[PDB]
């Protein structure tokens with residue numbers, strides 16, 4: 001007579017959802033098979049004073065219900081003032097290490113404290129699970145870190161040198177981006193880059209962002225020199241990592257072990273496949289970009305690593321795909337398809353998160369707009385590189401994760417920090433929305449805890 | 465062939481849940497007909513220094529999807545060190561804020577701290593007046609309660625309470641009895657305002673915990689005046705109007721008050737094998753006393769059936785039961801006689817039974833069964849016509865409040881993981897009392913409400929019970 005919600009959870013299998021809350025200041029893991037919050041943690045409790053918990057990634061655990069670790073970072077400073085919240089008040093850029101122990105979440109350490117390097121945007125796990133990487137776009141630094149020591153393996157620092165020394169034309173009329181090896185300054189191999197240290201801009205570029213800096217609405221010490229770095233993502237086949245740079249519309253493919261950049265991929269339609277990487281000294285490389293056609297954002301590899309994706313955003317909205325089958329040489333990576341839609345012609349929507357099915361035949365991609373247009377999810381034919389369908393969901397759509405058996409896509413909507421928020425679930429057989437679960441959180445990220453190294457091919461490792 | 469969770473919600477109705485988060489420092493509204501959080505707020509975002517969001521009560525609105533308003537308080541100080549979380553801030557904000565918050569159909573807005581308006585900060589239960597024309601808050605660290613005007617946030621009246629133990633050692637301070645003083649608390653600053661914000665007036669440094677009466681007796685509760693505590697909890701209202709009843713955990717008595725004339729009228733004695741009442745004696749225009757010979761159990765949960773004929777006060781700890789008064793004589797609460805106890809062979813020291821909700825017809829009540837970790841907590845279903853336990857169901861760690869859908873169809877509760885482990889929203893239907901399931905809830909809720917539509921709704925919301 002009465003409808004039981006456990007009938008709903010039962011289909012989804014034995015999977016743990018974890019998501020950070022941005023302005024809520026909490027991080028929260030959820031049992032998708034019973035509907036319980038297994039545990040949550042509020043950073044304010046540990047003396048954090050802008051706990052804007054931002055991006056996160058979970059390491060594989062052979063049994064998440066007994067134990068899992070993940071990495072979650074924060075933002076602070078003037079990131080507080082960006083959204084709808086009439087705030088009346090900490091630099092953020094903390095890299096917290098946290099273990100769920102079968103019962104509670106336990107803060108283990110701040111790794112930006114250990115390493116000396118604080119970084120505010122995407123967190124990713126290595127394909128080996130022996131490390132993680134973070135990027136930040138206020139400092140324009142990404143680094144891989146060791147799992148065991150929380151020390152930096154390599155860090156890279158990026159600078160824009162505009163052709164036109166004015167914020168309106170700084171990117172459009174092109175210029176030169178410098179790829180620089182960033183080395184420690186402090187005793188014991190530590191950096192002096194915690195919190196604010198080394199910010200070029202006093203807050204992260206939000207969506208629609210590149211215009212705000214162009215038009216001068218974004219203060220800081222060096223905005224003419226921003227490239228806004230977002231993510232360092234991983235080739236699921238090892239060796240390579242790719243740093244995405246939002247403003248000049250490029251990714252750089254780094255060699256992981258040899259600690260060198262190897263290819264610079266060009267994002268927009270109307271550019272070749274790659275630009276031309278140019279060694280200056282041992283620590284320094286450059287790349288010429290005659291004009292920037294569009295700012296890009298989302299990047300990621302298919303889980304077999306045959307395919308490599310960048311989202312152009314705003315000036316163009318599409319998905320750029322490269323042929324990445326040659327594991328051997330990323331200089332040989334060539335454009336193979338572009339994903340466009342008639343519905344992508346305007347300034348919005350934008351496509352800033354994704355997940356693949358494990359068989360590499362579909363992607364699911366978020367579709368973002370400011371209030372009030374509702375946001376949603378496009379389904380991508382990842383073989384034919386075609387839009388299959390677009391379902392509208394609601395306000396402020398963020399990330400997408402997928403249960404590892406390929407069956408459900410678990411997403412977050414985060415209400416611009418001030419309105420409706422939720423977890424949406426979508427089955428992947430016929431892509432019907434099964435519905436929404438209460439998520440009183442500002443999530444800009446979400447994971448299902450993975451069990452295996454292979455699981456990470458579709459977690460927060462290969463894509464953001 | 466897939467189950468849609470939308471079908472779960474489609475049955476629930478057009479109801480809107482609100483719960484505060486305690487150590488999560490957040491408050492959220494959930495739409496029970498869709499799954500969505502409608503909005504959430506994070507107090508830290510407003511320079512709140514200890515955002516332990518604590519008790520809440522919501523005002524009726526013709527359409528809560530268009531607008532509702534609520535009241536939410538905070539705790540600060542050594543309350544932070546109470547739980548399993550190894551908080552690291554040693555010298556936290558004082559809490560005792562009283563937030564007025566409006567949901568405008570899109571978001572939550574912090575209106576004002578009513579405790580800054582009035583000068584009177586209070587940390588425990590928050591309840592709405594049944595004319596919905598104000599609210600009340602109580603507090604067991606400073607043992608004061610008070611009704612506020614909804615429109616000015618100024619105090620209508622405030623009562624301080626103080627204990628004078630027969631035997632002046634913390635072990636015997638309540639068991640060997642004593643005398644409680646009820647004192648009219650008048651404002652001492654310009655603008656009709658009190659000087660009682662933050663930790664001001666604290667007699668002990670934390671609200672006593674369930675089972676806590678022992679911990680204070682043993683000298684384990686620090687503070688200025690631990691011997692002079694009564695641990696006031698709540699000021700709940702007769703839904704017929706007229707009376708507010710104040711609950712005192714350590715003496716095991718509730719004081720009935722005339723809300724319009726601002727005098728106490730009765731003192732109801734909680735424990736089995738005490739009379740109905742104890743003699744309320746008048747000293748002067750501002751001061752009453754009552755002698756309690758000996759205090760045989762601490763009490764906690766206190767409130768009224770939706771029709772006002774019954775008033776309940778749960779003994780907790782030394783006895784565990786539900787004490788029930790014949791409260792039908794709305795003209796004269798000196799005539800309120802005990803008519804029944806509720807017992808259970810499986811009640812006690814624990815479980816501790818510290819929240820309740822009635823059905824709108826006043827036929828059943830759902831009461832919380834609380835234990836420390838790891839004993840499963842849950843809900844007991846009571847027969848309120850016969851005064852018997854019908855059923856108990858096991859749910860999970862750290863059960864807290866109960867609300868009910870206004871058609872009377874779904875009890876909706878919260879479990880709060882001790883601030884550190886599992887937490888959820890619980891749905892249970894009232895026709896045959898089955899547990900329909902759980903909804904993620906990442907908060908340490910000590911309260912939750914369903915936003916009422918009418919004045920009649922409130923009789924089964926945060927107004928009559930806590």
Ligand SMILES: [Cu+2]
Nearest residue numbers: 055121122444
């Ligand atoms: Cu982000």
Ligand SMILES: [Cu+2]
Nearest residue numbers: 165222224225
């Ligand atoms: Cu310059």
Ligand SMILES: [Cu+2]
Nearest residue numbers: 122230352464
């Ligand atoms: Cu991003």
Ligand SMILES: [Cu+2]
Nearest residue numbers: 326327328329
């Ligand atoms: Cu190879």
Ligand SMILES: [Cu+2]
Nearest residue numbers: 368396397398
């Ligand atoms: Cu967004």
Ligand SMILES: [Cu+2]
Nearest residue numbers: 054055444445
């Ligand atoms: Cu973000």
Ligand SMILES: [Cu+2]
Nearest residue numbers: 352398399444
């Ligand atoms: Cu996002």
Ligand SMILES: [Cu+2]
Nearest residue numbers: 476477869871
């Ligand atoms: Cu209903």
Ligand SMILES: [Cu+2]
Nearest residue numbers: 519588589910
């Ligand atoms: Cu309480």
Ligand SMILES: [Cu+2]
Nearest residue numbers: 632689691692
């Ligand atoms: Cu004394």
Ligand SMILES: [Cu+2]
Nearest residue numbers: 589697818930
């Ligand atoms: Cu209470």
Ligand SMILES: [Cu+2]
Nearest residue numbers: 704706794795
């Ligand atoms: Cu009357």
Ligand SMILES: [Cu+2]
Nearest residue numbers: 862863880882
């Ligand atoms: Cu509790």
Ligand SMILES: [Cu+2]
Nearest residue numbers: 864865910911
């Ligand atoms: Cu409670």
Ligand SMILES: [Cu+2]
Nearest residue numbers: 518519909910
């Ligand atoms: Cu409480």
